[PDB]
Amino acid sequence: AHSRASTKVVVVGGGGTIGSSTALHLIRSGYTPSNITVLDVYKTPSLQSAGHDLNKIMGIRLRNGPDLQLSLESLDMWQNDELFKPFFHQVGMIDCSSSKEGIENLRRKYQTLLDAGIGLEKTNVWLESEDEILAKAPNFTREQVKGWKGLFCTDGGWLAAAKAINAIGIFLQDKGVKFGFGGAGTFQQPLFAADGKTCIGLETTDGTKYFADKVVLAAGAWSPTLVDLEDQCVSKAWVFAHIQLTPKEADAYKNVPVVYDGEYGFFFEPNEYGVIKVCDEFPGFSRFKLHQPYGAASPKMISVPRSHAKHPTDTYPDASEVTIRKAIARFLPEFKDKELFNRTMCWCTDTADANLLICEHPKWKNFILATGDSGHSFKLLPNIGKHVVELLEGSLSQEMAGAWRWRPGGDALRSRRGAPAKDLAEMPGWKHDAHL
């Protein structure tokens, strides 16, 4: 515990999901706005954030105990918090499959919700027939959904990810939070007291020093490139592309639920401009490089994001074009011949157990790690920062702290993905620098 009036906190990655949430909650908790500094490479929402997207799925996670609480806190805020409400489109979500194994997995998912005995059945509906699926998704045809079975999350939908992070940044700026970007916002190293162990701020790549009582490293997929996380977090890329619908087609897809099949991927209702985003589903791609983060004695093998923001001409691997097109054929057969654009790789960071890594650095007192999003944490935007502030103040619940603790040793490359990510170096087609 410490004064909220006199304590300075610097948040690194303030343009991102966990960083923005943290900044927001320092301000809501009553920290002096001018004592809060938010740093990022790019002005918020950072072009580089995994959160800078037309959309992310809003759904429920149950694996661990924290999952359930986090998921319910999240939903409550997206539904009722004035700041967040406009960016949650509660169109529901259909999780479907037509394979023997995929359907059994869905029945398992449903059983799981039911087994919790907190009334999840009232917002999660089993869809056993074509009729029930067609009712949730009128764009589908009966022939198309032959043998499909479904779980419908009536509570679910999608999140206007970039807009929501932007709204936080506006709020913070208004309150008088300090910001640093580019050279003045790019983390280089922590600064230490004379003991070499107590963190007292951080220095950026342009040499600017920021002194503060607590530092929060919420740099997302770049976090393990900035400090040695001992393989707890492996950054991986997922992929998406866009297709343009005509005004007529776009009208038809208005308010369609998010549609997801673990064997294919998912798509979202068109944005205001008639554009649908399609994603596949796969274990992600790594991009290992020899890299020496601050504090490391020798260079390490770290998956270093290949950022679309830095490399506008990058697309994604040829293997992704195949799987994206398979998703389109499955979900949007009438659009098979639409041309794709904005082919993009977007980066997240996996831990071995898919839980967050939110904890004080084991050696550097006052330096908090807040990462390990594991590719399903955008929905935690509204609430995750509350628990980061709790950690900062020493009041984080023991079960939550334990789940998120420093815990080197697992296999983050495989995580809970069913397979280790393949490396971009082995997956041709994404790099186009070489017309230059």
Ligand X SMILES: Cc1cc2nc3c(=O)[nH]c(=O)nc-3n(C[C@H](O)[C@H](O)[C@H](O)COP(=O)(O)OP(=O)(O)OC[C@H]3O[C@@H](n4cnc5c(N)ncnc54)[C@H](O)[C@@H]3O)c2cc1C
113 versus 162: smaller Cβ distance to ligand X = 162
Closest CA to 150 of 128, 166, 175: 128
Indicate the pairing of strand 288-291 with strand 300-303: antiparallel
Map residue 173 onto helix, strand or coil. helix
What residues are paired with 344 via a beta bridge?
A: 240
The answer to the question of residue 150 lying near ligand X (CB under 6 A) is no
The answer to the question of residue 371 lying near ligand X (CB under 6 A) is yes
The answer to the question of residue 87 lying near ligand X (CB under 6 A) is no
Half-sphere exposure of 158 (CA within 13 A, CB side): 25
The answer to the question of residue 226 lying near ligand X (CB under 6 A) is yes
Q: Please give the residues from 45 up to 64 whose contact with ligand X meets the rule CB under 6 A.
A: 46, 48-51, 56-57
Number of residues that bind ligand X (CB under 6 A): 39
What track of x and - describes contact with ligand X for positions 339 through 358 (by CB under 6 A)? -------x-x----------
Count of CB atoms situated within 10 Å of the CB of 390: 17
> Rounded to 5 degrees, what angle do the CA atoms 32, 37, 39 make?
160
The answer to the question of residue 15 lying near ligand X (CB under 6 A) is yes
User: Is 57 marked within a binding site?
Assistant: yes
Q: Please give the residues from 194 up to 223 whose contact with ligand X meets the rule CB under 6 A.
A: 218-222
Closest CA to 252 of 364, 138, 386: 138
Q: What is the closest distance, in whole angstroms, from the C-beta atom of residue 184 to ligand X in the complex?
A: 10
**Residue 52 burial (10 A CB sphere; 0-12, 13-18, 19+):** buried
List the one residue from 9, 10, 11, 16 that touches ligand X (CB under 6 A).
Answer: 16
The answer to the question of residue 153 lying near ligand X (CB under 6 A) is no
What track of x and - describes contact with ligand X for positions 270 through 299 (by CB under 6 A)? ---------x--------------------
Q: CA-to-CA distance for 135 and 407, rounded, in angstroms?
A: 46
* Segment holding 167, helix H or strand E: helix 161-175
The answer to the question of residue 179 lying near ligand X (CB under 6 A) is no
Map residue 15 onto helix, strand or coil. coil
Longest dimension (CA), the chain: 71
Residues flagged as binding site for FAD: 17-18, 40, 46, 48-51, 57, 187, 373, 377-379
Residues of this chain that interact with ligand X (CB under 6 A) are 12-13, 15-19, 39-42, 46, 48-51, 56-57, 185-187, 218-222, 226, 238, 240, 279, 346, 348, 371, 373, 375-379
